[PDB]
Design a protein around this ligand. Structure first.
Ligand SMILES: Nc1ncnc2c1ncn2[C@@H]1O[C@H](COP(=O)(O)OP(=O)(O)OP(=O)(O)O)[C@@H](O)[C@H]1O
Ligand SMILES: Nc1ncnc2c1ncn2[C@@H]1O[C@H](COP(=O)(O)OP(=O)(O)OP(=O)(O)O)[C@@H](O)[C@H]1O
Ligand SMILES: [K+]
Ligand SMILES: [K+]
Ligand code: NA
Lengths: 243, 247
């Protein structure tokens, strides 16, 4: 992608933070966000606001009033529209030059290859249900597709306990635990000699608050923001190693 | 006092399930002021609206600029040139049409701070980036025991997991916080106490600053928004703790 003057105006602050090479790297990147909800809608926003030049959004759910407490697209006039389309329209308002694709579908074990094989720079997995989540992680891991997944973000109030570690090492996260169990039984994914699954997971050390679970923007959005920052760090590091 | 509607419970049922029923009403009855609707404050304002805060005041007189796009939730193609506080207020009304939103189209000064703080806020979130008015706001809220959380510099930082809350005296790697301490002392007589604390809660990051990489500091949504989100979570926790302690 050739960066226009308007793009340099919008993302001058990105360039001043990450550098010119990173700005170009981001403009040339294509990142996929799967699940445009409490975590993924903010991830998508952050990607757009950091000069990522191409974004794919995968979700088939609509905006509901009950999303209001934790999803950036949940506004009165958006209720009943497709989440992914509302977020795509917002991204075009953030960066009119971003290449935005909507996949109006849910990821399944049956279709993940079709969806994941377009060649993404990174995949951010913000799915809440274990079966498709395991199928997505297993596929990206096998195919060496850069992935960051997110554990359970509900039932938590403290954004400062969010961190990234190998999926094998998460604690206080029942979703991540169920995911490990399904990866093992259904996909043969098991931890290596060093006790790692080779899957990066955003999780929180906070113990869950039972009232399903409630949620707050301040936590669920930070899950998405930490996923994006982690992906960009890994992308920049890889680019720095080439040469 | 706000009567919580059935629509409010649809919007904020997840808030009640997380913080509790008493908290839902506490939030609906609260009036929180966000000073500075920029890289930090615009996301704080968003988070307050989405957590069922019943009245929000926004204080800023700046306009949306295309260069805000990297880090401010209101920075959209069609908002460029409009007043930030008014754009953000209209958004809050779309989030919660029953939220009482007040716009103060002004900057805080030593001359006007008492008037603007005279409404009796449940909490003040200080997201000012300029030291002069920041010091005046902090000194006033501190003297008057007005609940306040301030934010250091969120620019020049890339790692959201290093953001935390501490006493303003103990921040590191934050030149804005450093200048602010100096102005508080020289202009307002605010100095640290026996325990070395200023008695002001400050959001900062332990991350070392990243200096400008092209042609001041750069910034990213993932960090500046998390400053605002950590500030809101801290304020809501302190409000809940105070309500529980009355009893
Ligand atoms: N298999 C899948 N592929 C892609 N997206 C998915 C899949 N399964 C779920 N999603 C989406 O992931 C998102 C998760 O959002 P989140 O957990 O914040 O709450 P929600 O599902 O919108 O609300 P609620 O939990 O009350 O139904 C949702 O938008 C959902 O539609
Ligand atoms: N005295 C004040 N009273 C109220 N709001 C203020 C005051 N001083 C500054 N602010 C606001 O704090 C916000 C800070 O935003 P941030 O530092 O992320 O970038 P910015 O200042 O918007 O960028 P730029 O300086 O390039 O326009 C601004 O919107 C500014 O108007
Ligand atoms: K947890
Ligand atoms: K710092
Ligand atoms: Na942290």
């Amino acid at each position: 992608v050739v960066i226009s003057d308007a793009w340099r105006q919008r993302f001058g602050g990105t360039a001043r933070l990450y550098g010119e090479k990173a700005l170009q790297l981001f403009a040339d990147a294509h990142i996929c966000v799967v699940g445009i909800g409490g975590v993924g809608s903010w991830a998508a926003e952050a990607l757009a606001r950091t000069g990522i030049g191409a974004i794919t959004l995968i979700d088939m759910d609509d905006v509901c009033v009950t999303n209001t407490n934790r999803q950036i697209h949940a506004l009165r006039d958006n209720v009943g529209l497709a989440k992914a389309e509302v977020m795509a329209e917002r991204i075009r308002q953030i960066n009119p030059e971003c290449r935005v694709t909507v996949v109006d579908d849910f990821v399944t074990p049956d279709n993940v290859a079709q969806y994941m094989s377009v060649g993404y720079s990174y995949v951010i997995d913000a799915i809440d249900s274990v079966r498709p989540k395991a199928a997505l992680i297993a596929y990206c891991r096998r195919n060496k597709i850069p992935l960051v997944t997110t554990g359970g973000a509900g039932g938590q109030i403290d954004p400062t306990q969010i961190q990234v570690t190998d999926l094998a090492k998460t604690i206080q996260d029942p979703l991540a635990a169920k995911l490990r169990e399904r990866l093992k039984s259904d996909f043969g994914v098991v931890k290596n000699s060093k006790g790692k699954l080779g899957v990066d997971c955003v999780f929180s050390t906070e113990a869950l608050v039972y009232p399903g679970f409630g949620a707050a923007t301040m936590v669920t959005a930070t899950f998405g923001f930490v996923a994006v920052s982690h992906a960009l760090k890994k992308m920049m590091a890889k680019a720095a190693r080439q040469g």
